TrEMBL record, chain A:
Full-sequence range covered: 271 to 324 of 324
Protein name: Major capsid protein
Domain of life, source organism: Viruses
Subcellular location: Virion
Naturally occurring in which organism (per UniProt): Gordonia phage Ziko
UniProtKB/TrEMBL annotation, chain B:
Localization per record: Virion
Top-level taxonomy: Viruses, Duplodnaviria, Heunggongvirae, Uroviricota, Caudoviricetes
Protein name per its UniProtKB record: Major capsid protein
Coverage span on the entire protein: 55 to 108 of 324
Organism: Gordonia phage Ziko
Residues forming coiled coils: none
Length: 54, 54
C-alpha cells in the first residue's frame, strides 16, 4: 500500500507505505464418531490440568 | 514552492504541503482613431499644388 489511509496515517501525503498481510482459515473437529445403531457423544481430545492445591 | 520535510507518521512536520499554480489574462482591445479633412472644390482647383495629395 502506497496511497491508502491506514490507522489514520495518509500514506502518500507522508511518504509512507504499508504491507497489508492477510490469510483466510477454517477449523473443524469430527468428534461424535459412529459407534453402533445408537448415536453416541465423544471427543477425540482429552485435557490434563495443573495441580491446583497449596 | 517546495518545503523541507520530517518523517513522522503523526506529527504535523512529517506532512508534504499542497500548493497552487495560477494564470491571469491580459487583453488587446482594438480602438479607433481618425480625422476628416474638408476642402472646397474651387480652392483645390486654384492652388498651384495638389492639395488632395498634401
Amino acid at each position: 500500500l502506497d496511497q491508502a489511509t491506514v490507522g489514520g496515517i495518509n500514506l502518500a501525503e507522508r511518504d509512507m507505505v504499508a504491507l497489508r498481510f492477510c490469510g483466510r482459515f477454517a477449523y473443524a473437529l469430527g468428534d461424535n464418531i459412529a459407534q453402533g445403531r445408537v448415536a453416541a457423544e465423544n471427543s477425540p481430545v482429552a485435557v490434563i490440568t495443573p495441580y491446583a492445591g497449596s | 514552492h517546495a518545503k523541507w520535510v520530517g518523517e513522522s507518521a503523526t506529527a504535523p512536520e512529517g506532512v508534504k504541503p499542497t500548493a497552487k499554480a495560477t494564470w491571469a489574462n491580459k487583453t488587446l482591445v482594438a480602438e479607433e482613431l481618425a480625422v476628416i479633412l474638408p476642402i472646397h472644390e474651387n480652392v483645390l482647383a486654384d492652388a498651384t499644388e495638389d492639395l488632395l495629395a498634401e
